[PDB]
Amino acid sequence: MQLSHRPAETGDLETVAGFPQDRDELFYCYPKAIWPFSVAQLAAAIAERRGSTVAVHDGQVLGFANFYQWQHGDFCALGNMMVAPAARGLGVARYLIGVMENLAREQYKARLMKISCFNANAAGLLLYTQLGYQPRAIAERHDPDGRRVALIQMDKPLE
């Protein structure tokens, strides 16, 4: 796994928009989106967010993330964490999160990174835990079927 990163480009949209494999996955990484995902929805997120970044290995875009909140000197909140299905479990998210932590520190002088994870996303909860994030609160949300879900709000200090 020889990973690199760069800002997301328009030519990456179709690939990245293909990452969420079902309604549940889309909900976990972009709860405001509507299934099916599309390049227009991805581009709209990019435009209203900051720091949209891809991870690349062996000439393939395998991961994407951005910030949905950014507060200089304070914190950033990581969003839209998406990984290519073939590349899941291989360290892409772990890699990209480290890149995004550096970017929060360097660009925003953030002291903290926030990550919110829906309860059903065990893989996410476990990975963020491995990376040092701690749970702080649980908020009530609703899924696309109007069912109640628990949004676990986590954070991690950045020096």
Ligand X SMILES: CC(=O)OCC1=C(C(=O)O)N2C(=O)[C@@H](N)[C@H]2SC1
Residues that bind ligand X (CB under 6 A): 29-31, 68, 78-81, 115-116, 151
Tokens 């690199």 found at: 4
Annotated binding-site residue? 130: yes
Q: Which of 25, 107 has the CB closer to ligand X?
A: 25
State yes or no: 81 annotated in a binding site. Answer: yes
CA distance 43 to 46: 5
Quick one: 41 or 57, whose CB is closer to ligand X? 41
Q: Is 89 marked as binding a ligand?
A: yes
CB of 22 to ligand X, least distance (A): 15
Q: Is residue 102 within 8 Å of residue 113, measured between CB atoms?
A: no
Q: Using CA atoms, how far apart are residues 45 and 40, in angstroms rounded to an integer?
A: 9
CB nearer to ligand X: pick between 79 and 91 = 79
To which residue do tokens 């520190």 refer? 105
